[PDB]
């Protein structure tokens, strides 16, 4: 029986919601902080489920909440990437069933974009025909697809989990044509890194001036954001790409 896919199934979140008060006209201020709060709540559902997903707490449990930090905008990107192509086949984006994005808040967010980058993404899903079930692998894999060049603490670990779910994978394609399929859904993955640096340089930049534009942050976002993120930025942790940029 599908084993492996059953898992990812059960432990898919349900909806996450991002508070936003849509009877106000739109704001970047407004915008920001509802994106923020929706960040921290899926945060917090992120850790749920990547805790839950097989072999991972095998890892090292200070590598756990690395990967998890260092890999977190991209798993959120191409979340958000499916849930728009789902929700409204990629017509906008798709951040909450409470905050839908349409051309004219990617504007006021200041993140247009960054956001016509993930609609894009969001429109290969359609394009690739991606089905459900590779996307549920393929987002466990994107956790185990960006670390620090000089290692985790328990970097041989991660290795192995990394290859068995590029294995269980190939297998959902499995399940010439094969050989196609994995070059597809592998280059679709690696896109998936470039848009969430654009983020990450965006949050950064934004936590550095949020006191003059009025964002704020929340107290644990800003520390991961602070401690976290520069090491991406700086080239101390870099994505894992199938295929050479
Ligand atoms: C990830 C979100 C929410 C979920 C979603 O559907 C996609 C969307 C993409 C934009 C993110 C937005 C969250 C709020 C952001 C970014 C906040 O970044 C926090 C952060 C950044 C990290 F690199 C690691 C972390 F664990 C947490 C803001 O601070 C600026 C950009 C915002």
């Given at each position: 029986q599908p084993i492996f896919l059953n898992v990812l199934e059960a432990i898919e979140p349900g909806v996450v919601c991002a508070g936003h008060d849509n009877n106000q006209p739109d704001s970047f201020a407004a915008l920001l902080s509802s994106l923020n709060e929706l960040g921290e709540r899926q945060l917090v559902h992120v850790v749920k489920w990547a805790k839950?997903?097989?072999?991972?707490?095998?890892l090292h449990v200070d590598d756990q909440m690395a990967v998890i930090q260092y890999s977190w905008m991209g798993l959120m990107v191409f979340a958000?990437?499916?849930?728009?192509f789902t929700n409204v086949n990629s017509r906008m984006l798709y951040f909450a069933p409470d905050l839908v994005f349409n051309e004219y808040r990617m504007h006021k967010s200041r993140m247009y974009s960054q956001c016509?980058?993930?609609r894009h993404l969001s429109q290969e899903f359609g394009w690739?025909?991606?089905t459900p079930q590779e996307f549920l692998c393929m987002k466990a894999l994107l956790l185990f697809s960006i670390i620090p060049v000089d290692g985790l603490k328990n970097?041989?670990?991660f290795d192995e989990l990394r290859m068995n779910y590029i294995?269980?994978?190939d297998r959902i394609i499995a399940c010439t044509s094969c050989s196609r399929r994995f070059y597809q859904l592998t280059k679709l993955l690696d896109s998936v890194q470039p848009i969430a640096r654009?983020?990450?340089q965006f949050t950064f930049d934004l936590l550095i001036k949020s006191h003059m534009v009025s964002v704020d942050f929340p107290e644990m976002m800003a520390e991961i954001i602070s401690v976290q993120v520069p090491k991406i930025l700086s080239g101390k942790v870099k994505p894992i790409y199938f295929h050479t940029q």
């Open positions: 839950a997903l097989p072999g991972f707490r095998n958000m990437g499916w849930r728009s016509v980058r993930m690739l025909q991606i970097q041989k670990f294995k269980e994978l654009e983020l990450h």
